Amino acid sequence: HWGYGKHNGPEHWHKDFPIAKGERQSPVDIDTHTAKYDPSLKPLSVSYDQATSLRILNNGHSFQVTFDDSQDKAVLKGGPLDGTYRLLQFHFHWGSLDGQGSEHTVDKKKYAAELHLVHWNTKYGDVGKAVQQPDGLAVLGIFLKVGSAKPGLQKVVDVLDSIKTEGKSADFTNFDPRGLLPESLDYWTYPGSLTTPPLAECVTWIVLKEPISVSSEQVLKFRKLNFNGEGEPEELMVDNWRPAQPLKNRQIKASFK
């Protein structure tokens, strides 16, 4: 089964998932000097006021906070997107050290972690159908650097002890994901893929330029999670990131000058 270890990590994934070597794989390095300002891009619309979080789960490769997506409650619109995308879950990728952990890079710079807010296109009815479409998902990517604490993250970090190992979940209601956003919604966008198997090429990526700051204590608690299940040898959940993939025939567009 796939993971981030030495003989099941990203360099192995193509054997079970040939699309790993495909034409629009993610993440990528964002070369800021080559990204072109696109004046026809619209401002992002992030409408999270009615979000209903449900559960938090350790799935053995990250932890995810899940939302009620049976209605238009928390949606992403505008920007590069046509139509309405419902928030399904968010999760993170992070490192064993502050100098690595993000999946996207900016002029080859790696951040300590990366937040992915995953949304699916409501015209396809459910997320399973959406992942089979080239415009099925929109993922909002946000970089984390280590410095001052992010108050809106603390509720997440404080429940992680209760989902230490693979397969554990806990109630996680009334969490407001607006507390995870930076001030600016300036972004880069490009067509790409899931960054975990099955690596489906169904994602419009929207990566925010402004990172959020989190404290060393907050990210250290990420690194106390386990890849393994309860009663198995402990393997810390760290470095659960896929490295940058070939850009190939794609252009990254910027929403800002």
Closest CA to 190 of 205, 207, 201, 200: 205
Residue 104 assigned as binding residue? no
Whether 10 and 4 have beta carbons less than 8 Å apart is answered as yes
Is residue 61 part of the contact set for Zn ion (CB under 5 A)?
Answer: no
Q: How far is the CB of 110 from Zn ion (least distance, A)?
A: 15
User: What are the distances in angstroms from CA 178 to CA 74, 184, 223?
Assistant: 10, 12, 24
Whether 56 and 163 have beta carbons less than 8 Å apart is answered as yes
Closest CA to 73 of 106, 50, 96: 50
**CA distance linking residue 249 with residue 80, whole number of Å:** 18
Amino acid identity of residue 17, one-letter, is F
Nearer to Zn ion, 19 or 257 (CB): 19
Count of residues that bind Zn ion according to CB under 5 A: 1
User: What are the distances in angstroms from CA 127 to CA 120, 137, 178?
Assistant: 6, 8, 22
Strands 203-208 and 137-146: parallel
Residue with smallest beta-carbon separation from ligand LSA: 3
Q: How far is the CB of 103 from Zn ion (least distance, A)?
A: 7
Is residue 104 part of the contact set for Zn ion (CB under 5 A)?
Answer: no
Q: Which of 12, 14, 33, 61 is catalytic?
A: 61
Residue 1 assigned as binding residue? no
Residue 91 assigned as binding residue? yes
- The one of ligand LSA, Zn ion, none whose footprint includes residue 104, by CB under 5 to 8 A per kind, is none
Nearer to ligand LSA, 30 or 194 (CB): 194
Q: Segment near Zn ion (CB under 5 A), from 70-78, 110-118, 154-162, 206-214?
A: 110-118
Instruction: Output DSSP code: residue 241.
Output: -
Query: Which residues pair with residue 56 across a beta bridge?
Result: 65, 170
Instruction: Output DSSP code: residue 183.
Output: S
Instruction: Output DSSP code: residue 154.
Output: H
Active site annotation includes 12: no
Q: Segment near Zn ion (CB under 5 A), from 111-119, 170-178, 209-217, 246-254?
A: 111-119
Q: How far is the CB of 194 from ligand LSA (least distance, A)?
A: 4
Q: What is the SS3 string spanning 192-221? A: ECCCCCCCCCCEEEEEECCCEEECHHHHHH
Q: Provide the token pair at 179.
A: 């507390």
Residue 32 assigned as binding residue? no
- The one of ligand LSA, Zn ion, none whose footprint includes residue 235, by CB under 5 to 8 A per kind, is ligand LSA
Nearer to ligand LSA, 74 or 118 (CB): 118
Q: How far is the CB of 257 from Zn ion (least distance, A)?
A: 28
- The one of ligand LSA, Zn ion, none whose footprint includes residue 66, by CB under 5 to 8 A per kind, is none
Residue 195 assigned as binding residue? yes
Per the annotation, where are the binding residues?
91, 93, 116, 195-196
Catalytic residues: 61
Per the annotation, where are the binding residues for substrate?
195-196
Contact residues: Zn ion, CB under 5 A: 116
